[PDB]
């Protein structure tokens, strides 16, 4: 997350970190929300690697114990069916985890509440990015959880030329594009928390940036728009 601030160790208690074995040790690949006590919710394009991974909740720092973390392996994999790993722009960024144990609730540890489905914000709604992202262009993760601050960009102003053009679909949401703050490398797969009526909730799943570098003007960090997959997450969950 660029520009972002240190997060409150208890403020985001849905935040995940997903990890892979790197050798004799793991490393942060990408964030994601616990949405069931062994179901996370992440971006496809996360999971397109054949690593080993496991997730880890209650995280507050990465490089020191917490007193807080639980550490559970991922035992299926289920990305969206549509999905196409060299057609990002198309759409259907997003992927379901099973862990092999369910998490253990607490004040650290809790499951992201869902939008209801079609929900659509208003431009300039206030959310917050989560992760442990680059905090700059070409820089290094975050040490402890950061926070952005960055209101949304309704699709009819995102979709513009000066913006994200045909590039970016109904089925997503764009939040920040002032130049300061912004999703970046290692954020992808986390939620952006938007309050509506008095409480968060996950609207997003973090999906891209410009390539022209992470905090652009008028480029929009583009999510996955949660509440248009609705149907889809309860179908999976059901099923598996
Ligand atoms: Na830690």
Redesign the pocket.
Same mark, same amino acid.
């Given at each position: 997350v660029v520009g972002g601030t240190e997060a409150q160790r208890n403020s985001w208690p849905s935040q995940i970190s997903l990890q892979y074995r790197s050798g004799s040790s793991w490393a942060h690949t990408c964030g994601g929300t616990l949405i069931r006590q062994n179901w996370v919710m992440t971006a496809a394009h996360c999971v397109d690697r054949e690593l080993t991974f496991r997730v880890?909740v209650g /995280?507050?720092?990465?490089?020191?114990?917490?007193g807080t /973390?639980q550490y559970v392996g991922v035992q299926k994999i289920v990305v969206h069916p549509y999905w196409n790993t060299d057609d990002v722009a198309a759409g259907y960024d997003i992927a379901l985890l099973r862990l092999a144990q369910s998490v253990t609730l607490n004040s650290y540890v809790q499951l992201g509440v869902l939008p209801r489905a079609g929900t659509i914000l208003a431009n300039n709604s206030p959310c917050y990015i989560t992760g442990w992202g680059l905090t700059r262009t070409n820089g290094q993760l975050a040490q402890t959880l950061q926070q952005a601050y960055l209101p949304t960009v309704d699709y009819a102003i995102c979709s513009s030329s000066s913006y994200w053009g045909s590039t970016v679909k109904n089925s997503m949401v764009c939040a920040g594009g002032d130049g300061v703050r912004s999703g970046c490398q290692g954020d992808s797969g986390g939620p952006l928390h938007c309050l509506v009526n008095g409480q968060y909730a996950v609207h997003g799943v973090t999906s891209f940036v410009s390539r022209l570098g992470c905090n652009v003007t008028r480029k929009p960090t583009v999510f996955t728009r949660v509440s248009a997959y609705i149907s889809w997450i309860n179908n999976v969950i059901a099923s598996n």
């Open positions: 880890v /995280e507050h720092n990465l490089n020191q114990n917490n /973390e």
